[PDB]
Design a protein around this ligand. Structure first.
Ligand code: FES
Ligand SMILES: [K+]
Ligand SMILES: [Mg+2]
Ligand SMILES: [Mg+2]
Ligand SMILES: [Mg+2]
Ligand SMILES: [Mg+2]
Ligand SMILES: [Mg+2]
Lengths: 72, 118, 45, 128, 137, 85, 48, 97, 74
RNA sequence: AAACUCCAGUUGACACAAAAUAGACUACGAAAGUGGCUUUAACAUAUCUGAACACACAAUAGCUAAGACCCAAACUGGGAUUAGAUACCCCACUAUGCUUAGCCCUAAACCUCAACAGUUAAAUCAACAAAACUGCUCGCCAGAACACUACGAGCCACAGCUUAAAACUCAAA
C-alpha cells in the first residue's frame, strides 16, 4: 500500500515503541498507524515533500504528546 | 600508463639515500617516465632477510615512485633496478589509483542445497 | 542413524566450544581439556 | 602506426586541449597509453577514411574495419609470440569472420565493398 | 599480570625474565621427531652446541628407536648433559611428527630443565619438492 | 629467512608445558598444518586430491544442512500438549 | 574537467629542475598507508 | 477499480544488505596493518571467507594484496607481523585454551 | 490433535459422526470387511484439516474419492 | 638387511625444480587445460547450423636433438619377504616429469547430457541417471561376436594413429 513507505520510514526512525500491538483488537490503532494517519491528513492539506512531511507529522504528534523515541 | 615503483633501498646514510633516489628517478626520466610524485614510508626492518648483490640485508628504506611511462620502458626500468647495488628490491606495479572501486552493493545470499549438485 | 551421528557431532562441537571459552569457568578454561569423542545414547564424553 | 604524439580518442575533441602544457600533451598522447588506444586511433582513422558515416558502428563496414584492426593486432602479437596457440586461433577465426563479412558486403553493396578492399588493403579471394 | 601466549618480541624490552636472562638469550632445545628416530640438541643463543642426544646414541636400535620411551630417555640424557654446562631454562623448537615429538619434552622436564616456550618448526614445503609415491600396502 | 621464535610459538604459562603443547597442537590443527604434513608425507595424485576435496566439501555441506534441519526440528521436542488425543 | 585537473596536478610533478629538492623533501617526509578496520567497519587510523 | 486494492512497488521494509566490513574501501597491498588482520598470528595462513566474513570480491582482493605484499617485502609470510598483534580482531576464530 | 476434542464434541452434539484419531488403513475402501457388509458408508465427509501430521494429504480424501463420497473441506 | 658414516643436528650462504594457506571460491578458456608475484601483449563474430579427411588446437605417456637435474621415478642392481622367481616393502640409480626446437595426435579427452532457439501447458515420465518436452541443423547407429581386427588409403607416425570390413559361428548379445 501507499502507507507502506511511511510505515517503513517510521519504523526505521523510531522502531517499535513502548506501546505494544494489541492485534486482538480490530479497532486498534498503533503509533505507526497514528503517524500514517497524520501524514495522510497533512498530505491532504497539499504538501508533497516526503522528508519534510515526515518531520511535520512528527512535530504534530509530539505536540499531541505521543512518545517518539528515536532508535539511535 | 600510471605505474607505481615500490623500492626497498639499502639502509644507508641520508646523502647516500638521496643519491640513490636521484639516480633512480634520473633513470626513470631517461626511459621516458614523467615522475608524478615520490614518497617515503621510512626505514624499517624487512619482514624477512633479503640477499642481494652478494650481501644480506635486515633493514631497508621504503619509497614509492608514482610515475607515467610508456609500456616499453617498464621492462627496461626493471632491468636497471636489477643492476643497481643500493636497491635491495624493486617492483613496478600498475598504479592502484587507476583501478576504480566498482562499488559492491552487498553479499547476495544463495541457497546451500544447490551447491551439492552445482 | 545419520541423524544421531549429526547429533553426536553437534554435541561434540558444543562441548568443545564450552571448554575453549573462559566464560564457562576459569578452572575449566585453565585446564584446557580436549575431547577425543562424544556419543549420545545419556551422553558419554 | 599513428605518431606517438597523437592524442587519445577521447581527449582530441575537448576544447582547449591545444593550449595545455607539453607534459599534459604527453600524458594524453599515445606514448603514455597501451596498445588498445593506438588500435582505437587506427580504427577511427580508417572509419573517417572509408565509410560515409563514421558515427555509425553497427554498419557492416564499421564491423569489418574493427575486425581488420583486431586482425592486425593479433598478427603483430603473434610476430613476437610464435608459440601462442590461443592467439593463433583468435587470428584465424577473426580472418574467417572477416571473410564472411566481406562476402556479405560484396553480395549487398559492391561499391562500398570495393572501397573497403582498397582502404584496408584486403584482397577478396573466393574459397576453394 | 595478564599472561600472553605470544612470545616477547626481540628488540622490544619486556619485563619477562628467566634467571636474569632475556628471552633472546635463553638457550634453544632443537627437537627433531622423525618416524624412526628422535634427535635433541641444546645450543646457546649464539648457536654454540652444548648437548646432543638421540635414540640411537642412547643404545636403542632399529624399531626400538621409534618408541616414545626412547625419546624420553634421549630427553633425559640431553637435559642432564646441558644442565652439566649450566643450562636451566630452554626454548623448545620441535619439528617433525614423530612418536617422540612430545615425549622428548617430557624427558627434558624429567632431566631438570625448565621449558619456557614451545615452538614448532616442522618443515612444511609451500609446494616444494615432490614426495615419494604412496605405499602400496 | 624469517625471524625465529615468532611463528608457531607458544609461551609456557607457569611451567605448564603440557597445556602449552596442547595449545600449539590445537593452533596447528585449526590452521590445518598437521593435516597438511600428514597429506604431504606421500604424494597425493591430482585426481585423488580433487576427488577428496570434492567429497569433503559435499560432506561439510550435507553436515551443515543436517545440523540446521535437526536444530529446526528439535524445537518441537517438548512435552505433548494434547496428550490423550 | 579531468584534463584541467591533470594540468593543475602537473605543476607538482617532479622534473629535473626540482629533482634534488623533491628528493630531500620526500626524505624528510613520512607517508603512512597502514590503517586497521573494526568489526563494525570503522577505519582505525594509525596511532601516530 | 478500488483504492483499497494493493499497489505494485518494491518492498519498502526491505532492510539493506549487510555489506562486508571492507566494502566501499580500497584494499591496498601497502596497508600491511589491514592485511595482517586476516592472517593467522601463528602461521601467517590467510583466513578463509568463512572466517573473515568477507565478500568474494573483497576476499579475493585481500588474498591478492597479501600475496603481493609478501613477495614484495612488505609483509612476513610465515607469521603475522608482531607490531600488529594488538589490532582489532575482525576474524571469527578463537585459538587459546 | 489440538481440536480433536472440540470436533468430536461438536459432531456428537449435532448428531453426526467424528473421526479424529489415527485413520486405519481401509476404514472406507475396506469398510465391508471391517464392519460387515451391511454397513452404511458416510454420505458426506467434512475435513476441518486436510493434512495429516506429516503434512501429506489425509488418506481419507483419496479414499472418499475412491468410494464416491463427496468431501467438504477447509 | 643393505646402504651412507664428510654421516647427522644447529647456524649461514644457496634453483632452469614445484607453486601451502587463500580455495568452504566455482572463475578463465573452444576443448585439453589453467590456483606464487610483476609487467607487456591479450581473451573471434550485432542470426544461428556447418567437416574422421580442409584450417588450427589437443592431458598424460612417447620419439628426435641440446641443455638443466633438488625431488620423484618405469627399467636395472642390491636388500628383505616368499618353497622359489617376479610383485607388494627398503635402498641406490636411468629413461622420464623440466627448458629450447620439432614430432607423435591418444584417454573413463566424461557434465558418458551435440549446437542454436523456445516452453513449463498437457500425458510428467519404460527404468535408472540428470524434471519433461518442442522447433531447427549437422554428425552418427541398424543383432551379438569376428573387430580400437584384416585389406586399401593417408600420416615426420615404422611393435604406430585415423578411416574400417567380410567369411565361418550363435539365438541370443
Ligand atoms: S559486501 Fe559489498 S564489497 Fe563486500
Ligand atoms: K587448496
Ligand atoms: Mg559455425
Ligand atoms: Mg599432445
Ligand atoms: Mg634423471
Ligand atoms: Mg578431463
Ligand atoms: Mg556440432
Amino acid at each position: 500500500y501507499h502507507e507502506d513507505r511511511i510505515r517503513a520510514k517510521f519504523y526505521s526512525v523510531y522502531g517499535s515503541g513502548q506501546r505494544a500491538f494489541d492485534l486482538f483488537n480490530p479497532n486498534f490503532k498503533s503509533t505507526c498507524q497514528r503517524f500514517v494517519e497524520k501524514y495522510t491528513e497533512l498530505q491532504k492539506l497539499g504538501e508533497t515533500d516526503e522528508e519534510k512531511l515526515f518531520v511535520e507529522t512528527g512535530k504534530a504528534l509530539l505536540a499531541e504528546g505521543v512518545i517518539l523515541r528515536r532508535v539511535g | 600508463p600510471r605505474y607505481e615503483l615500490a623500492l626497498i633501498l639499502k639502509a644507508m646514510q641520508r646523502p647516500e639515500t638521496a643519491a640513490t633516489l636521484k639516480r633512480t628517478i634520473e633513470a626513470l626520466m631517461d626511459r621516458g617516465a614523467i615522475v608524478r610524485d615520490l614518497e617515503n614510508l621510512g626505514e624499517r626492518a624487512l619482514p624477512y632477510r633479503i640477499s642481494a648483490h652478494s650481501q644480506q640485508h635486515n633493514r631497508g628504506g621504503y619509497f614509492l615512485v608514482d610515475f607515467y611511462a610508456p609500456t616499453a620502458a617498464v621492462e627496461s626500468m626493471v632491468e636497471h633496478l636489477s643492476r643497481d647495488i643500493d636497491v635491495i628490491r624493486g617492483n613496478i606495479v600498475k598504479h592502484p589509483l587507476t583501478q576504480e572501486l566498482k562499488e559492491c552493493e552487498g553479499i547476495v545470499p544463495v541457497p546451500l542445497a544447490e551447491k551439492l549438485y552445482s | 542413524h545419520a541423524r544421531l551421528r549429526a547429533l553426536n557431532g553437534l554435541l561434540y562441537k558444543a562441548l568443545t566450544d564450552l571448554l575453549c571459552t573462559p566464560e564457562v569457568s576459569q578452572e575449566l578454561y585453565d585446564l584446557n581439556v580436549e575431547l577425543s569423542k562424544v556419543s549420545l545414547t545419556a551422553c558419554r564424553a | 602506426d599513428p605518431p606517438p604524439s597523437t592524442l587519445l580518442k577521447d581527449y582530441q575533441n575537448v576544447p582547449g586541449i591545444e593550449k595545455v602544457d607539453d607534459v599534459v600533451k604527453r600524458l594524453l598522447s599515445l606514448e603514455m597509453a597501451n596498445k588498445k588506444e593506438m588500435l582505437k586511433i587506427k580504427q577511427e582513422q580508417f572509419m573517417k577514411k572509408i565509410v560515409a558515416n563514421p558515427e555509425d558502428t553497427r554498419s557492416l563496414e564499421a564491423r569489418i574495419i574493427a575486425l581488420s584492426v583486431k586482425i592486425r593486432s593479433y598478427e603483430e602479437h603473434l610476430e613476437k609470440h610464435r608459440k601462442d596457440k590461443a592467439h593463433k586461433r583468435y587470428l584465424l577465426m577473426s580472418i574467417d569472420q572477416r571473410k564472411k563479412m566481406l562476402k556479405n558486403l560484396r553480395n549487398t553493396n559492391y561499391d562500398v565493398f570495393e572501397k573497403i578492399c582498397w582502404g584496408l588493403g584486403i584482397e577478396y579471394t573466393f574459397p576453394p | 599480570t595478564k599472561f600472553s601466549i605470544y612470545p616477547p618480541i626481540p628488540g622490544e624490552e619486556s619485563s619477562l625474565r628467566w634467571a636474569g636472562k632475556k628471552f633472546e638469550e635463553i638457550p634453544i632445545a632443537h627437537i627433531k621427531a622423525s618416524h624412526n628416530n628422535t634427535q635433541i640438541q641444546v645450543v646457546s643463543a649464539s648457536n654454540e652446541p652444548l648437548a646432543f642426544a638421540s635414540c640411537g646414541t642412547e643404545g636403542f636400535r632399529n624399531a626400538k628407536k621409534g618408541t616414545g620411551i626412547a625419546a624420553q630417555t634421549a630427553g633425559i640424557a640431553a637435559a642432564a648433559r646441558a644442565k652439566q654446562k649450566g643450562v636451566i631454562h630452554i626454548r623448545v623448537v620441535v619439528k617433525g611428527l614423530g612418536p617422540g615429538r612430545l615425549s622428548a619434552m617430557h624427558g627434558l622436564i624429567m632431566g631438570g630443565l625448565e621449558v619456557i616456550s614451545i615452538t614448532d618448526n616442522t618443515p612444511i614445503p609451500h609446494n616444494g619438492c615432490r614426495p615419494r609415491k604412496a605405499r602400496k600396502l | 629467512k624469517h625471524l625465529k621464535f615468532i611463528a608457531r610459538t607458544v609461551m609456557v604459562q607457569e611451567g605448564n608445558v603440557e597445556s602449552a603443547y596442547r595449545t600449539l597442537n590445537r593452533i596447528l590443527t585449526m590452521d590445518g598444518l598437521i593435516e597438511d604434513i600428514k597429506h604431504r608425507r606421500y604424494y597425493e595424485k591430482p585426481c585423488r586430491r580433487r576427488q577428496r576435496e570434492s567429497y569433503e566439501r559435499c560432506r561439510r555441506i550435507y553436515n551443515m544442512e543436517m545440523a540446521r534441519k535437526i536444530n529446526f526440528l528439535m524445537r518441537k521436542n517438548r512435552a505433548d500438549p494434547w496428550q490423550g488425543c | 574537467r579531468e584534463v584541467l585537473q591533470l594540468q593543475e596536478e602537473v605543476k607538482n610533478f617532479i622534473t629535473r629542475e626540482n629533482l634534488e629538492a623533491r628528493v630531500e623533501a620526500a626524505l624528510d617526509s613520512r607517508k603512512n598507508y597502514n590503517w586497521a578496520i573494526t568489526r563494525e567497519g570503522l577505519v582505525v587510523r594509525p596511532q601516530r | 477499480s478500488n483504492e483499497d486494492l494493493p499497489i505494485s512497488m518494491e518492498n519498502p521494509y526491505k532492510e539493506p544488505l549487510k555489506k562486508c566490513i571492507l566494502c566501499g574501501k580500497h584494499v591496498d597491498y601497502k596497508n600491511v596493518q589491514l592485511l595482517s588482520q586476516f592472517v593467522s598470528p601463528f602461521t601467517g595462513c590467510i583466513y578463509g571467507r568463512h572466517i573473515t566474513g568477507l565478500c568474494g570480491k573483497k576476499q579475493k582482493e585481500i588474498t591478492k594484496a597479501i600475496k603481493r605484499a609478501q613477495i614484495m617485502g612488505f609483509m612476513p609470510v610465515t607469521y603475522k607481523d608482531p607490531a600488529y598483534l594488538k589490532d582489532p580482531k575482525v576474524c571469527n576464530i578463537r585459538y587459546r585454551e | 490433535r489440538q481440536f480433536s476434542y472440540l470436533i468430536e464434541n461438536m459432531a456428537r452434539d449435532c448428531g453426526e459422526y467424528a473421526h479424529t484419531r489415527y485413520f486405519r488403513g481401509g476404514m472406507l475402501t475396506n469398510a465391508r470387511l471391517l464392519f460387515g457388509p451391511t454397513v452404511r458408508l458416510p454420505d458426506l465427509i467434512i475435513f476441518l484439516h486436510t493434512l495429516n501430521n506429516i503434512f501429506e494429504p489425509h488418506v481419507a480424501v483419496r479414499d472418499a474419492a475412491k468410494m464416491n463420497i463427496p468431501t467438504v473441506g477447509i
